[PDB]
């Protein structure tokens, strides 16, 4: 109907209880086009605790 | 034995100065905060002024805001309370009381003071 | 808050990751009684949990 990529499903979790910490960045808009070919972006992350 | 004594008070000419002092037996001013209350006939005791337990700062009532001066001496267990700019309406029966517990901070409202003083009366006339 | 109710309406909120105003609350004159246990208000500002 909108003829555009959209998000309509969210199965990350089914419940959320006992909130302790919250954090979020400024709202933005990220392209969701179905690009094909090679990867033009490389993102590296390191996590430590 | 735990008992409180009061001094000062009485009749003072309007616009003069009055000194209120009291002592406590079995307790020390440093551990337990000290506060003062004043009452009139047919009315419930209310607050006038007090000194914080830590001694950093002190609270005055709205009617006598920024008028009195309170000092304490830990070496003799006594309290100083000077009165200035007294008015006719200031007349009432004053009490010297000690907070219920040795908790820090201050408490001016509510009946948090378990032990009360002799209730010495202060009168202002012109 | 305008939801203040009697004692029977107990409540509990968890506050995390904020810079408080202990000094402002202590020196505020609106609050009738500020009696605190275990730590002096002056030392309460420097120390925390």
From Swiss-Prot, chain C:
It comes from the Viruses. Changing residue 3 to T: In strain: Omicron/BQ.1.1, Omicron/XBB.1.5, Omicron/EG.5.1. Binds to host ACE2. RBD also interacts with the N-linked glycan on 'Asn-90' of ACE2. Cleavage of S generates a polybasic C-terminal sequence on S1 that binds to host Neuropilin-1 (NRP1) and Neuropilin-2 (NRP2) receptors. Interacts with host integrin alpha-5/beta-1 (ITGA5:ITGB1) and with ACE2 in complex with integrin alpha-5/beta-1 (ITGA5:ITGB1). May interact via cytoplasmic c-terminus with M protein. May interact (via N-terminus) with host bilirubin and biliverdin, thereby preventing antibody binding to the SARS-CoV-2 spike NTD via an allosteric mechanism. Attaches the virion to the cell membrane by interacting with host receptor, initiating the infection. The major receptor is host ACE2. When S2/S2' has been cleaved, binding to the receptor triggers direct fusion at the cell membrane. When S2/S2' has not been cleaved, binding to the receptor results in internalization of the virus by endocytosis using host TFRC and GRM2 and leading to fusion of the virion membrane with the host endosomal membrane. Alternatively, may use NRP1/NRP2 and integrin as entry receptors. This is Spike protein S1. It comes from Severe acute respiratory syndrome coronavirus 2. The chain holds residues 344 to 392 of 1273 of the full protein.
């Amino acid at each position: 109907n909108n003829k555009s990529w959209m998000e309509s499903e969210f199965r990350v979790y089914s419940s959320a209880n006992n909130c302790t910490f919250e954090y979020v960045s400024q709202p933005f808009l990220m392209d969701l086009e179905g690009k094909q070919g090679n990867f033009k972006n490389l993102r590296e992350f390191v996590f430590k605790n | 034995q735990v008992q409180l004594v009061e001094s000062g008070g009485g009749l003072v000419q309007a616009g003069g100065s009055l000194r209120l002092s009291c002592a406590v037996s079995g307790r020390t001013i440093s551990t337990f905060g000290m506060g003062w209350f004043r009452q009139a006939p047919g009315k419930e005791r209310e607050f006038v002024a007090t000194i914080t337990r830590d001694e950093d700062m002190l609270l005055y009532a709205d009617s006598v805001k920024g008028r009195f001066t309170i000092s304490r001496d830990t070496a003799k267990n006594m309290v100083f309370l000077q009165m200035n700019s007294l008015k006719i309406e200031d007349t009432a029966l004053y009490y010297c009381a000690v907070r219920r517990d040795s908790s820090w901070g201050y408490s001016r409202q509510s009946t948090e003071y378990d032990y009360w003083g002799q209730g010495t009366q202060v009168t202002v006339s012109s | 808050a305008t939801r203040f109710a009697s004692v029977y309406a107990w409540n509990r909120k968890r506050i995390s990751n904020c810079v408080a105003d202990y000094s402002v609350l202590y020196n505020s004159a609106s609050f009738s009684t500020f009696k605190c246990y275990g730590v002096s208000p002056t030392k309460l500002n420097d120390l925390c949990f």
